[PDB]
Amino acid sequence: RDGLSNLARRLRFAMKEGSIWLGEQRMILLHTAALGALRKELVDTLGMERARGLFMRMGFHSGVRDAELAKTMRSGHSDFGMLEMGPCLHTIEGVVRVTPLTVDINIAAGVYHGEFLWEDSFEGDVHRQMFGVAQAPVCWMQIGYATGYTSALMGKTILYRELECVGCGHPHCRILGKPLEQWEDGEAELALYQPD
Amino acid sequence: RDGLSNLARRLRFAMKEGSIWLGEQRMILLHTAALGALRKELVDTLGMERARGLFMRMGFHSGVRDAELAKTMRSGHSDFGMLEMGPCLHTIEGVVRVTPLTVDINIAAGVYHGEFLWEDSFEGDVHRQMFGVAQAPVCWMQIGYATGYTSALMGKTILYRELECVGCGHPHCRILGKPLEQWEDGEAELALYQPD
Ligand SMILES: O=[N+]([O-])c1ccc(O)cc1
Ligand SMILES: O=[N+]([O-])c1ccc(O)cc1
Numbered sequence: 453r454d455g456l457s458n459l460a461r462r463l464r465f466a467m468k469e470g471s472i473w474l475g476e477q478r479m480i481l482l483h484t485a486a487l488g489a490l491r492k493e494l495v496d497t498l499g500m501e502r503a504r505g506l507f508m509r510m511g512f513h514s515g516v517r518d519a520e521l522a523k524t525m526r527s528g529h530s531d532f533g534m535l536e537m538g539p540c541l542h543t544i545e546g547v548v549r550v551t552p553l554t555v556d557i558n559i560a561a562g563v564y565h566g567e568f569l570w571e572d573s574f575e576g577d578v579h580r581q582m583f584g585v586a587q588a589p590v591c592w593m594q595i596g597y598a599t600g601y602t603s604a605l606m607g608k609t610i611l612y613r614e615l616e617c618v619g620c621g622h623p624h625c626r627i628l629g630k631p632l633e634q635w636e637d638g639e640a641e642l643a644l645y646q647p648d
Numbered sequence: 649r650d651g652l653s654n655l656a657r658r659l660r661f662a663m664k665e666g667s668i669w670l671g672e673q674r675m676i677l678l679h680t681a682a683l684g685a686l687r688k689e690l691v692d693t694l695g696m697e698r699a700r701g702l703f704m705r706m707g708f709h710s711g712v713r714d715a716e717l718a719k720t721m722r723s724g725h726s727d728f729g730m731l732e733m734g735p736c737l738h739t740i741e742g743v744v745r746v747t748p749l750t751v752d753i754n755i756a757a758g759v760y761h762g763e764f765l766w767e768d769s770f771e772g773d774v775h776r777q778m779f780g781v782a783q784a785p786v787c788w789m790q791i792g793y794a795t796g797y798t799s800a801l802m803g804k805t806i807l808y809r810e811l812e813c814v815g816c817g818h819p820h821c822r823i824l825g826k827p828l829e830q831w832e833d834g835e836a837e838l839a840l841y842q843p844d
């Protein structure tokens with residue numbers, strides 16, 4: 453659409469340089485099976501908790517870099533048209549089919565309240581094939597990205613949580629995003645986003 | 649070499665289902681910076697040697713899957729034909745631009761001795777900006793890839809090693825693949841491909 457066809461110009465493949473660039477960031481195409489295998493080794497080795505952390509932060513970094521890109525395409529787009537580049541880029545990257553349910557966003561006022569549908573989550577899919585169906589949501593990297601993108605664009609922390617997840621048997625994933633303090637457990641969600 | 653054009657049609661973007669396909673494998677587009685940041689956490693917390701193995705093994709799984717795909721369209725393709733598909737896929741993905749130097753392969757006879765030139769190793773050019781110049785070769789995931797690809801192709805253990813590598817500060821990377829039996833340290837090398 454207008455959010456994908458436009459962000460498509462920022463993507464160029466250079467088989468002449470063996471490289472891929474999305475905006476100003478170099479990219480690779482990576483086999484989901486390969487990342488699933490890495491997940492199983494990290495989970496089995498560092499535990500499920502330490503592992504989710506590592507994936508959430510990898511997602512965060514990715515979401516931030518795409519927010520930088522989006523911000524160079526500010527133009528005459530609204531806050532919402534700004535926001536929607538995130539879901540757009542997430543789709544182009546082959547991670548999930550993002551479907552915005554309802555978004556309330558003002559950047560200047562520090563107001564954001566967002567809810568999205570996720571169809572065909574790579575991360576849920578991969579997780580059931582490696583661990584089987586899961587107790588709690590598994591799209592760690594995908595959530596980190598949401599968190600990373602939206603914080604960067606708002607210049608303030610916006611944590612997301614998966615409300616429903618394909619990893620837990622549900623038909624899809626579903627997520628809610630809102631400012632850190634608007635979260636009861638928001639202090640400790642933020643803790644997941646720190647290395648040391 | 650010229651199989652780039654052919655292999656490149658196997659790669660489709662399926663935005664409707666938010667998914668990218670290489671043959672029958674689902675792929676994602678991932679920022680090298682984010683991958684760079686996971687490598688750094690892993691090196692800093694698990695040890696440089698222990699992270700090397702994790703990425704080698706992720707590479708290995710990637711390679712085995714491009715070999716699995718290249719084994720579906722071997723219509724009128726010499727053994728060198730099928731071998732050259734690895735470098736192309738690797739290049740196409742955006743991991744590295746690969747120059748075959750001297751390839752000697754006969755699958756039926758167990759014959760394989762390959763040397764390759766690597767320019768623009770994302771990995772070496774990522775370990776460059778996180779740990780500065782390294783001392784030992786640092787394109788772990790990339791080498792794992794060759795190893796997994798050719799071993800799947802030959803039906804036997806082909807290990808690769810880097811002779812030169814940008815992450816050590818040389819102009820370029822250069823690799824040598826050959827059967828396990830023709831490596832001085834081959835058995836300790838095959839050991840890295842096993843998970844702890
Ligand atoms: O920034 N956002 O609001 C997003 C970005 C990606 C996504 O999958 C969902 C929401
Ligand atoms: O199949 N192979 O021998 C390969 C594959 C990839 C690469 O970068 C070099 C060699």
Ligand SMILES: [Zn+2]
Pocket residue numbers: 573576589590591614616617618619624625626
């Ligand atoms: Zn999910």
Ligand SMILES: [Zn+2]
Pocket residue numbers: 766769772785786787810812813814815820821822
């Ligand atoms: Zn190298």
